[PDB]
Design a protein around this ligand. Structure first.
Ligand code: GNP
Ligand code: CA
Ligand code: CA
Ligand code: MG
Ligand code: MG
Ligand code: NA
Length: 157
């Protein structure tokens, strides 16, 4: 069956691990344990196709193998949004391509201390020709949509 190699990237503390664990294990990780590098694998049916998701959860604290990249910032962390650009460039680097499957994810959308407005992230994603999706690893809002949207982007390339 098809295997989709997904890589989750973004600054430290934005919720990459919480998002992946909510998707794969269906619970919210409340504590903050910085990641070095972890992998998750799960067989799922996406749009009627049985497939294997292979998800690499990377370190944000200061790749070339992935088929699509989930680029995460937190909507209450303006710096993590400004850091997105640096990840967009590293991805071009490690893939040696200018047209990589990516999805921009604004996480922690359950929080009210918002400093990145939806329209600003929509504009960033627009400029790279990719979707913008907001998520909450805490409430599960948008979580499946973000990862499945990345699979649907990979299928387009
Ligand atoms: N309210 C809220 N908190 C969240 C959300 N996602 C993650 N968090 C919290 O933010 C903290 C950091 O989450 P974590 O997933 O470890 O971040 P990370 O991006 O994997 N960090 P690292 O790059 O160091 O591995 C944790 O306390 C976690 O509970 C979310 O959607 N909402
Ligand atoms: Ca594959
Ligand atoms: Ca918990
Ligand atoms: Mg982590
Ligand atoms: Mg502002
Ligand atoms: Na390269």
């Amino acid at each position: 069956m098809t295997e989709y190699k997904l890589v989750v990237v973004g600054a430290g503390g934005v919720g990459k691990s919480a998002l992946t664990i909510q998707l794969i294990q269906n619970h919210f990780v409340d504590e903050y344990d910085p990641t070095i590098e972890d992998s998750y694998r799960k067989q799922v049916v996406i749009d009627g196709e049985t497939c294997l998701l292979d998800i690499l959860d990377t370190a944000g604290q200061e790749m070339r193998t992935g088929e699509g990249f989930l680029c995460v910032f937190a909507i209450n962390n303006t710096k993590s949004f400004e850091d997105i650009h640096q990840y967009f460039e590293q991805i071009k680097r490690v893939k040696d391509s200018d047209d990589v499957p990516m999805v921009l994810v604004g996480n922690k959308c359950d929080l009210a201390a918002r400093t990145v407005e939806s329209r600003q992230a929509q504009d960033l994603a627009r400029s790279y020709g990719i979707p913008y999706i907001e998520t909450s690893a805490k409430t599960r809002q948008g979580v499946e949509d973000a990862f499945y949207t990345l699979v649907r982007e990979i299928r387009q390339h």
